[PDB]
Paper text:
Like MhFbpA and Thermus thermophilus [name] (TtFbpA), McFbpA adopts a typical fold of class III periplasmic iron binding protein with the two globular lobes. Similar to other [name] structures, McFbpA has two globular α/β domains named the N terminal lobe (Asn1-Trp95 and Val235-Val273) and the C terminal lobe (Tyr107-Ala221 and Thr274-Lys312). Each of the lobes consists of α helices surrounding a twisted mixed β sheet in the center. These two lobes are connected by a pair of antiparallel β strands (Phe96-Phe106 and Gly222-Val234), which acts as a hinge allowing for the adoption of either the open or closed conformation. Isogenic mutants of [name] and AfeA were constructed, demonstrating that [name] is essential for the utilization of human Tf and Lf as iron sources and that AfeA does not take up iron from these iron sources.
Our structural studies yielded the structure of [name] [name] in two different forms: an apo open form and an iron-holo open form. Comparisons with other FbpAs indicate that both iron-holo and apo McFbpA in this study are in the open conformation. The tyrosine residues (Tyr141, Tyr197 and Tyr198) are positioned in the same orientation as in other known structures, which classifies McFbpA as a class III iron-binding protein. The Fe–OH distances of Tyr141, Tyr197 and Tyr198 are 2.1 Å, 1.9 Å, and 2.1 Å, respectively. Analysis of electron density typical for metal ions, as illustrated in Fig. 4c, localizes the iron atom in the appropriate position. In the structure of iron-holo open McFbpA, we have determined that there are three tyrosine residues binding to the ferric ion and have confirmed that these residues are essential for the bacteria’s ability to utilize Tf and Lf as an iron source. There is additional electron density around the ferric ion in the structure, but it is indistinct for fitting waters and ligands. We believe that it might be multiple components from the crystallization condition that are non-specifically binding to the ferric ion, resulting in the electron density that is indistinct for any one component. In one of the four [name] molecules in the holo crystal structure, we determined that two additional ferric ions are occupying the density surrounding the ferric ion bound by the three tyrosines. This might be caused by insufficient washing of the iron-bound protein, allowing for a slight excess amount of unbound ferric ion to remain with the protein.
Residue numbers in the entry: 1 to 312
The structure:
């Protein structure tokens, strides 16, 4: 048989995934890749006549958007509920997180002692004036981070924090996380906020970046470090809902988690799968157990928050 996967991941990342599953089960896995928004806009337009069986997309913000658009169908999977922690999957069973990333603090260890660091909020402290760099607010990772900050600390507090962030900027917000991390390495930025897998990707290509850039896991005293996911769900109008579900259940297994998460320097979502050494080297940390669907529920508030704060 054959299944169709609409994927917002890097095309090279799913190619080994499709091959390993065809070798194990004989099922052909066709991958159609596009950006998350356009891909979901495609799935919504195709309706009942769609050829897609599985949607794989990035960030709980987008997974919540796809669920609100009605393009996913809830599935009852004992395998997925056991392999995937509850905070990393949709409460109404429409999607399941399969890799974990952290959005957290990075710093220049030649200029910043980790004892000076603690929380996202404390980055608004005036001691950071002229030392902070951020990636643009026009991005789902930052929308999702601020969405959880609103849920954890309230709207008024978060308004003050993000306004404090902007007042502390050493440079204009960067267009992507890798550019931010490189500007820390260049010495322009002393502290920043980014996704961990870009750091693993950057150290893989330029190992010397570690001299000027280290990771700090934020909010260890409170709720924990913000984590987010890439995840999958069965397309509502799939012609093969049973085989679509079997593929997603396989992705949560040990062997597939290594292929799915390790190659992109992300954490496995399955906690019985130990992270790849390059990732495990950064250390253990407490992660927030807020359900990551809150990243979507509070997305509009986060957008409004960053806009009122002058966070470009
Ligand atoms: Fe990314």
């Amino acid at each position: 048989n054959e299944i169709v996967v609409y994927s917002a991941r890097a095309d090279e990342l799913l190619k080994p995934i499709a091959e390993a599953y065809q070798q194990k089960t004989g099922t052909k896995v066709t991958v159609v890749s596009d950006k998350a928004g356009p891909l979901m806009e495609r799935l919504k337009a195709e309706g009942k006549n769609t050829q897609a069986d599985v949607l794989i997309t990035v960030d709980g913000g987008n997974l919540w958007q796809a669920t609100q658009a009605g393009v996913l169908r809830p599935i009852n999977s004992s395998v997925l509920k056991s392999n995937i922690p509850s905070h990393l999957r949709d409460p109404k069973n429409h999607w399941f997180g399969l890799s974990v990333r952290a959005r957290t603090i990075f710093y220049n260890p030649n200029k910043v002692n980790p004892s000076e660091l603690s929380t996202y909020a404390d980055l608004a402290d005036p001691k950071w004036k002229g030392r902070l760099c951020l990636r643009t607010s026009n991005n789902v990772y930052n929308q999702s981070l601020v969405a959880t900050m609103i849920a954890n600390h309230g709207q008024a507090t978060t308004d003050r924090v993000v306004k404090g962030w902007v007042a502390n900027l050493a440079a204009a917000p960067f267009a992507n996380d890798t550019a931010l991390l490189e500007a820390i390495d260049a010495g322009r930025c002393d502290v920043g906020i980014a996704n961990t897998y870009y750091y693993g990707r950057l150290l893989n290509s330029k190992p010397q970046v570690a001299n000027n850039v280290k990771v700090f896991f934020a909010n260890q005293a409170g709720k924990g470090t913000h984590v987010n996911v890439s995840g999958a769900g069965v397309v509502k109008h799939s012609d093969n809902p049973a085989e679509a579900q079997k593929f997603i259940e396989w992705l949560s297994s040990n062997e597939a988690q290594r292929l799915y998460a390790d190659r992109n320097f992300e954490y496995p979502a399955n906690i019985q799968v130990t992270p790849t050494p390059a990732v495990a080297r950064w250390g253990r940390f407490k992660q927030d157990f807020i359900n990551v669907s809150v990243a979507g529920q509070n997305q509009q508030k986060a957008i409004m928050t960053m806009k009122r704060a002058g966070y470009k």
